[PDB]
Symmetry: C2
Subunit: 358 residues, 2 copies
């Protein structure tokens, strides 16, 4: 009986999986899609706020995309509780989050641009969200896709627990590289060989240096740190050890990087064998250490029986050590993928709907 209006701004397979899960959703609160941008130029919507048929939105009559200023006024004029679903990674759309929040529009998004920018933007979003009639901001899918990381961490902070240590493998592609490369047994597999097979399997982009610089990893560490109380200024304000070797960053094309990368496999082989000599595996981790007053993203060593040393494939994992959890809360699973990301976004949008629908 209760209902909310939904505006979907998507592009790729995450948006396609979200619409399909939304169309097949059987829930108490009803969702009515009034705006759906298929690409960066087309959008499906009616002047009378008629429901967009999610079964045939791909062939429905489309118009030019409403600018963010005009989309806000369009959604406000319906006089209904509305949720904005930002299924992109667009920095421009993320810059418009404060305007959406003031106008009473709620946001459910996997985009982490607005949450891993400057600290001022972070404080600005949630201050206007806490204000009267401010929209709700749920962003569980920004860290670990549908894994329950941000939600349980916010409940920890809200009820009075004090977090002292957050460790995590928050990149599916880089988790695959190190789990395939560094185990508890002797191995001769080369760093460049696993990078090249991870690229053609789909874990790394066609140019792997976008994933190997650890910047996307650092954005997720910034989000968890700010939720936990470690108020980081930006993902550039702490140490992020890029996996790209220094003399290979100026190369313009990916083929030149993949051609020169194998000449650094000797340096990685010795480092992996050096840690194996002291009975440890290598892992590319992000750490929020309140005790050490340190936030960092880089390679670390872990004992053979450590939970991180038994990760398989591209599984993500996060370890949350707090005052009430001397032994840390550990959550692991698939941290990426179209369906699991769309699940995290839809779960957030349902929680918002239960709170604002009428």
């Amino acid at each position: 009986s209760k209902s909310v209006n939904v505006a979907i701004i998507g592009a790729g397979v995450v948006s396609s999986a979200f619409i399909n899960q939304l169309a097949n959703l059987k829930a108490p609160v009803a969702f009515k899609v009034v705006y759906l941008a298929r690409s960066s130029k087309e959008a499906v919507f009616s002047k009378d706020y008629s429901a967009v048929d999610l079964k045939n939105y791909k062939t429905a009559p489309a118009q030019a995309v409403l600018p963010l200023d005009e989309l806000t006024s369009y959604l406000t004029a319906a006089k209904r509780p509305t949720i904005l679903v930002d299924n992109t990674s667009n920095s421009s759309i993320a810059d418009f989050y404060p305007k959406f929040v003031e106008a009473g529009i709620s946001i459910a998004t996997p985009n982490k641009k607005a949450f891993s920018s400057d600290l001022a933007t972070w404080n600005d979003i949630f201050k206007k969200s806490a204000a009267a009639n401010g929209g709700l901001v749920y962003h569980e899918a920004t860290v670990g896709a549908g894994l329950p990381i941000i939600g349980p961490l916010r409940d920890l902070v809200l009820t009075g627990d004090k977090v002292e240590k957050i460790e995590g493998i928050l990149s599916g592609s880089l988790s695959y590289v190190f789990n395939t490369l560094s185990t508890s047994e002797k191995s001769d597999k080369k760093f460049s060989d696993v990078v090249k097979v991870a690229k053609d399997l789909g874990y790394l982009e066609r140019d792997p240096r976008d994933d190997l610089n650890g910047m996307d990893f650092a954005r997720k560490v910034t989000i968890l740190a700010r939720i936990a109380g470690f108020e980081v200024e930006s993902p550039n304000s702490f140490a992020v050890d890029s996996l790209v070797p220094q003399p290979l960053e100026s190369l313009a094309t990916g083929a030149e990087f993949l051609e020169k990368l194998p000449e650094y496999d000797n340096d990685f082989q010795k480092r992996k064998d050096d840690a194996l000599a002291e009975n440890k595996v290598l892992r590319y981790v992000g750490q929020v250490d309140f005790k050490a007053n340190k936030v960092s993203v880089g390679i670390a060593k872990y004992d053979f029986d450590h939970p991180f040393a038994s990760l398989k494939g591209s599984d993500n994992v996060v370890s949350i050590k707090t005052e009430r959890y001397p032994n840390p809360l550990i959550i692991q699973g698939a941290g990426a993928g179209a369906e699991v990301t769309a699940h995290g976004v839809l779960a957030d949008a349902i929680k918002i709907a239960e709170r604002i629908a009428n």
Copy 2:
């Protein structure tokens, strides 16, 4: 600015841990406690619904507790959104949940008696909850205390994911004994000596057979199965391999049972030492197998690399394999304790207040 009325029913260490966490809460929703039952005979409440001072409820003028039928009328007469916090294990208040829910009173509790009984009681509670003006029912603290298990599992079922395999260690007591009695090495430590430690170390209660029959384990498995769609009739509808030998069940004293347990110390030694030759570790797990259409609670052999083979003492763990998670979602951490249980109840209460307050 917005608020709900709260009626707290409690007893011992969890109730005091919850009241302290609620007294120091800095949340956007206000909680006005209009009824606080300290013991089974004394309660603090006023004719005018005056708020109970949470820092002085112990040294306040107390009245006789209101019977359940009359407590419901007292709470509904205020015409305010109300949450009942049931910090007990009492079976009479659990039986009254349908009356609480139909009256519009929401419930947040760690008491699993209402959720681990007959299947007709389970459907009745959530049908009256789903009905118009029905109270919300949040019970995350029933399985794994404050660990995020029921929440995430409800979400993926709600968004259309198909569960196919749930495994879990759900007893801190039984997790301890099986961790310090079955490893990848080789141990002559016998079954009685491990139990004798927890016999008087607070892990096991006065009568060790209470935490060895696996019935509390079976209660939590029943809850997870019903959430995921395996509608179990009762915890006595599937196999529960009690660790208490049958000839020892007839004894009336826990000390007399423990002294004749070493008769089977060599039988478990045979069980333990043999599984090691198979490169397997013995763990006491609960399983919800949708493919085999079977629920069970008992001993099972697990590999050395399996996550269940390296648990930190009494840490609980749950594994959820679904259509979207071929590699299962795994959540582990402390599954018991007054502060972490109270946190699970408080986080649920906050989620309820976010949905009903005005």
